[PDB]
Design a protein around this ligand. Structure first.
Ligand SMILES: CCCCCCCCCCCCC/C=C\[C@H](O)[C@H](N)CO
Ligand SMILES: *C(=O)CCCCCCCCCCCCC
Ligand SMILES: *C(=O)CCCCCCCCCCCCC
Ligand SMILES: *C(=O)CCCCCCCCCCCCC
Lengths: 283, 60, 268, 235, 5, 235, 60, 235, 60, 5, 5
């Protein structure tokens, strides 16, 4: 029944002491932190405490959309030698660093995911031609479904995959997704392999990457400009923002202290010295 | 189906309330209530088998 | 207690095995959760589980290591460290799935004239960093799983420059807890410290922790045990002191599902 | 249609908003939770756990295991500091990377009491009395026991209870302090001194380490969420 | 109708 | 007008949305339903029906009637497999096109128990005992009766009850498996062996076929709707 | 004319409900409720005239 | 979706609007108020406080301390004015910068009664009777006591009660006057005269100052908020 | 959760009212009610220790 | 008014 | 439900 927005405990007034009670003396070997409050070691006055921990609840700490990727697409002249660019992104929070570091204060999590899409476009050639307003198709292709090979092939029909048709210059697109994990929680860390190497089998055959579970964990987003080719080329970018709503987290971890280096916990040589010089007896 | 909750009013100009109606069948579509609970840190700060009494010796 | 009972003096008995200690610093139960069998409401594989009880939930002692002034630290993974331990290991390799909790008892005595302090940490999903800056997530199954011998920490990151035949092993740097986070924060994981003037052992009772009720013990380690010298070994005025460190670990409430022929892993 | 009038803020995307939106996977069969151990409900729970301080960030000791070790010795009594530290939990380089410091760097403001616990890692045969001090801001930072004595302090007697705690009580002009170096919201001075001296018998190491830990008290809170400077992604 | 918290 | 503020998601078209919209044919006289036989309420009903497995997809037998026929003979007892199959109901080529496999290819995730039923199509005079096996994943896939015996199995005695069923019980680490080949969510091994041998009198065919069927149990479910790869429209 | 139904709540942060009002005269304009029923597969899995008892011989 | 129809005013930003909008810092821990002394609830409270009038804005006295001093002397009785002032509280240069005048310059309209209080700052030995007058508008502005006497007035006897107040009662055709010079909403004439003369004994200063104050009565109000001309920002 | 208040009606064509519903959890998001209080100016106009009686001498 | 399921 | 001022 204690809520996140409740005021923290009052300071109770306390006077001088001379006894066998020894709050200040402890033994951290036990693995415990000494639960002291100021009245345990100094004289205190009575204070009616009004402050609360409302903004540091797990929900409030994560209640922000973070950019997780930028997808590039275009729509060129029909006459181009290069193919019309459509984008394919493997869904993840590990291509950027800020949300990743926040989630990684914990080992496991459960949440509903809100994705918001910001879309911007521009001209590229020092032309004077125009382009009519673009519609974008953001298709979710879950593991197993046919990934698009061409901006206009049959997969963009989406009979079963969810798609967003976004109109340029309108409010940024937004959808929600439930907790979709195949485990009871999302694992931010998996100390294991997806394959057991057997003796009776070749090493190549039993091999797999360290810390990787399902190769295609969550599938991909495939994005295209739905408009046909235009004489003047336009390039667009789709920025994806992820917000974990309705979140639960388990098993706290020390935060990432040296630069991320890949999707795993690996680090790069030359980045391992975060701390700066400061003298022991200098304030 | 309207839910009526109170705001914790910070700066002032009774209880001020606000209203919420869920528009969708899927709870995943709902906004966050922010009506959250707190817990005691003990599973991390005092994970010892024998209960700690802070005025007593931690080792006896 | 007025009848003599102490925080420092404990006896633990599991199966046909008993541990005694006269210099404990209480004992820890990780996240306040004692080990338990899988409940029906959380169950997932439907076949009757195997529950070996005393045949596997007993204390197994691993190979003793040695602490010296140049020691940077040691690590083990569970269940990996116990994969060859009596009927626990057999039960593990005969079944697709398995879950287990553990009592971990780290042993290290010295004398009133020695000093030093070992941080003993139990880390859920203790993913360690690899030796490579040419390929990430490349540590081989064989190198990730040392079995009972465990592995060690290093004070220095040194990238594997053999691109033709890569070592494919971990390079766990000690102040970065072998995983890119600062060691001074490892205390948020369930831990005890063996500070020689105070205690000669650490005891951690670990629940089964995972994002699943049960999983492949052969593919996945649930817990990592990391032991690092927070304060270096020292004695009298000897330049090269040594004291042993022994690990004894007991599986608790372990159950297995998906029985078939035995797994014969490529371990070298 | 119902007559409506579009207000300012219409069509914007505020990243801190809290609205409903359509579900892309309707009627999805969600996997139930299980009772995983170690659930956290508030980031301040993590701040209440003791984590170890990198006190000695000298050029040769920083970014090595040595930075956590404060060396003491049995030398004759002095009134000179073992260590000096500013109470700037998010910005002083010795505190900013502790778990407390790290969480504080995701917030603009902090308030409440803190506590420092020191662990003596010498041999059992080693004895000593030390003085741990907190001077609230506004005077000359203590460089001698004589000044440090006049502020908040604990005289630590080394013995079977291996460790000792000094509580830094919330003493501030403002209701919240900033999580950066700021003179107006400065916190004051933490320091440690020899009260008597470390004494050892023969056949015993004459030098040893103490380790130090910081954690928040139950009256501690933070606010105004913000991005940290403790991680980046250049390119 | 209406819930109230 | 009522003051309103447009939120993100405004004006988008999500193909999975569920909104009201105006009727283009108001007051239309709808023809009533009649009680047509065979109504289906859930796709998993179809997955619970036995459909026949194309076990033998050899280069000459695939895409012909022969692919459904597993040939047995009265040869001397061997411990070698009649057939070997991976429990990957949406992706193993022998299972992926069964009605179960087909429905699974419109979903990303599957869970639950399955069952394999074999039909002996030899003459009445033919007798035999066979061993049907399911090995959960993680060890060497069974290539000899000796290994297959150690896993889940049914020893089938051929006789008047023409058919025999082995249930593959839901035994998995994850709460749902993927509908593609994936090592982390692998299902294990289905195999069939001779327990004794097929025996026939004289004047009787010495070779015969068995047919195999797969269907879902009542605890079986799927989720995360998706497009199949089992149909396309190039150009 | 408001209809109030419950959501099956998957991930959590009582019964959470949502509200629905039909705006049009034609039922064809309505959204889908997704409040659907299940049935037993028997008309396809057991279409035999004599009831099947699974522990018994299918042929007697 | 609910059928809606966008009305005029849609998407505009009226700077005087009063709508809700999303909070950029959700669940922020607000610091509570404390009971600071001097809370104000309405700007007219400030207008009811006496502030001093810069009566003498001569070229040499304006923008100096001297502008607040009205010099009197013991000269023989005259019927000529000590001072003359227009009742244009927001626009007459002598009233427009008093606290009352300043608040009135943030509003277009004012109404209600006012009061002028004069303070005699001569020596105790100095005596005198003065006449303070208010003539409502529409006739020749009083330049002689004879005319001023005929309007609203107070004959002030100097003595122990150092000060004297004349109330300018709300006498207007319109229900509110403009806060600019306007003939239609003109307020009339304030003036001060010698009723007898200032008399002093010997050894006493023969000249002295009076100071004057203006404030609003409890029936005073303003309306139609507007920007002031009393501050600007060229470039 | 609707709040119903009266308007002070200036120009006329009973009590006319208007309705207000708060849409957000944070009181900071609310519009201004303009339902404000007045106080007496005394702390600024009469801050003297002995109460002033205006018909009496201010100095006695 | 209101139906409830 | 409804407050009234
Ligand atoms: C029309 C757009 C629909 C978009 C649908 C996206 C569905 C996929 C959800 C992905 C969930 C990602 C959660 C984050 C990562 C995992 O926590 C970790 N790698 C562990 O499992
Ligand atoms: C409970 O909700 C009964 C009260 C209904 C109040 C009016 C509802 C406002 C419009 C909701 C439309 C439905 C959203 C799909
Ligand atoms: C039953 O509907 C009675 C309750 C009405 C609640 C408010 C209705 C919200 C607006 C609906 C407008 C009509 C749609 C054509
Ligand atoms: C109290 O509010 C009960 C009456 C509800 C009246 C209808 C509410 C109109 C729509 C409010 C939607 C919620 C805003 C987040």
């Amino acid at each position: 029944a204690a809520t996140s927005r409740d005021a923290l405990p009052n300071t109770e007034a306390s006077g001088p002491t001379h006894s066998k009670e020894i709050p200040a003396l402890t033994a951290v070997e036990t693995g415990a932190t000494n639960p002291l409050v100021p009245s345990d070691t100094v004289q205190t006055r009575h204070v009616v405490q009004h402050r609360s921990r409302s903004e540091s609840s797990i929900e409030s700490f994560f209640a922000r959309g973070a950019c997780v990727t930028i997808m590039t697409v275009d729509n060129p002249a029909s006459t181009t030698n290069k193919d019309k660019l459509f984008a394919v992104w493997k869904i993840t929070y590990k291509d950027t660093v800020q949300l990743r570091r926040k989630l990684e204060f914990f080992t496991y999590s459960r949440f509903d995911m809100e994705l918001t899409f910001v879309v911007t476009a521009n001209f590229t050639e020092t032309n004077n031609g125009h382009a009519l307003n673009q519609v974008y198709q953001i298709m979710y292709v879950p593991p197993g479904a046919p990934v698009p090979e061409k901006w206009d092939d049959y997969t963009w029909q989406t009979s079963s995959n969810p798609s967003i048709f976004y109109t340029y210059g309108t409010a940024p697109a937004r959808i929600s997704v439930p907790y979709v994990g195949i485990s009871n929680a999302y694992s931010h860390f998996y100390d294991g392999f997806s394959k057991v190497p057997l003796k009776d089998q070749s090493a190549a055959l039993g091999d797999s990457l360290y810390g990787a579970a399902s190769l295609n964990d969550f599938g991909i987003l495939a994005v295209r400009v739905v408009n046909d080719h235009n004489p003047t080329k336009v390039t667009s970018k789709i920025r994806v923002y992820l917000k974990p709503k309705h979140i639960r987290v388990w098993c706290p971890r020390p935060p990432r202290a040296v630069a991320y280096y890949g999707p795993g916990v690996d680090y790069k040589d030359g980045t391992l010295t975060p701390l700066s010089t400061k003298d022991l007896t200098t304030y | 189906g309207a839910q009526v909750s109170s705001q914790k009013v910070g700066a002032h100009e009774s209880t001020i309330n606000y209203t919420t109606i869920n528009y969708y069948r899927d709870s995943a579509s709902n906004a966050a209530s922010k009506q959250d609970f707190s817990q005691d840190p003990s599973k991390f700060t005092e994970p010892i088998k024998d209960v700690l009494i802070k005025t007593a010796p931690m080792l006896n | 207690e007025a009848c003599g009972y102490s925080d420092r003096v404990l006896q633990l008995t599991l199966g046909n095995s008993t541990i005694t200690t006269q210099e404990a610093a209480n004992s820890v139960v990780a996240y306040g959760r004692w080990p338990e069998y899988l409940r029906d409401s959380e169950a997932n594989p439907v076949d009757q589980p195997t529950e070996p009880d005393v045949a596997a939930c007993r204390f197994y002692t691993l190979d003793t290591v040695s602490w010296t002034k140049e020691s940077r630290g040691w690590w083990w993974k569970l269940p990996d460290a116990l994969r060859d331990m009596g009927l626990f290991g057999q039960n593990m390799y005969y079944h697709y799935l398995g879950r287990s909790g553990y009592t971990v008892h780290v042993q290290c005595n010295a004398s009133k004239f020695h000093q030093g302090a070992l941080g003993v940490f139990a880390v859920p999903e203790m993913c360690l960093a690899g030796d490579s800056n040419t390929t990430t997530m490349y540590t081989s199954y064989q190198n990730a799983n040392p079995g009972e011998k465990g592995g060690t920490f290093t004070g220095t990151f040194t990238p594997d420059n053999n691109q033709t035949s890569p070592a494919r092993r971990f390079c766990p740097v000690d102040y970065l807890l072998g995983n890119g986070t600062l060691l001074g924060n490892a205390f948020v994981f369930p831990h005890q410290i063996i500070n020689l003037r105070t205690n000669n052992c650490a005891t951690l009772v670990l629940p089964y922790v995972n994002s699943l009720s049960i999983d492949s013990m052969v593919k996945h380690n649930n817990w990592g045990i990391a032991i690092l010298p927070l304060a270096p070994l020292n004695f009298a005025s000897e330049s090269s002191p040594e004291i042993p460190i022994t690990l004894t670990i007991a599986p608790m409430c372990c159950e297995f599902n998906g029985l078939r022929n035995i797994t014969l892993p490529r371990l070298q | 249609g119902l007559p409506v009038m579009n207000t300012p803020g219409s069509n914007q995307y505020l990243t801190a908003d809290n609205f409903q939106s359509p579900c892309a996977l309707p009627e999805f069969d969600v996997t139930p939770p299980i009772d995983i151990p170690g659930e956290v409900k508030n980031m301040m729970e993590l701040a209440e756990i003791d984590t170890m301080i990198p006190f000695d960030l000298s050029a040769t000791k920083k970014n090595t295991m040595e930075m956590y070790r404060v060396r003491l010795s049995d030398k004759p009594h002095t009134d000179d500091p073992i260590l000096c530290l500013s109470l700037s939990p998010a910005s002083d380089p010795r505190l900013s990377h502790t778990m407390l410091g790290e969480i504080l760097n995701y917030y603009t403001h902090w308030a409440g009491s803190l506590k420092f616990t020191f662990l003596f890692c010498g041999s059992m045969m080693a004895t000593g009395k030390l003085l741990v001090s907190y001077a609230p801001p506004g005077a000359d930072p203590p460089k001698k026991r004589k000044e440090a004595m006049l502020g908040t302090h604990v005289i630590w007697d080394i013995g079977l209870q291996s460790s000792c705690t000094m509580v830094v009580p919330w003493i501030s002009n403002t209701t919240y302090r900033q999580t950066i170096d700021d003179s107006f919201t400065e916190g004051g001075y933490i320091s440690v001194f020899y009260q008597t001296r470390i004494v050892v018998p023969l056949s015993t190491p004459r030098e040893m380490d103490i380790l130090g830990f910081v954690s928040a008290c139950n009256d501690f809170s933070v606010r105004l969420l913000r991005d940290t400077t403790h991680i980046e992604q250049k390119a | 109708g209406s819930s109230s918290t």
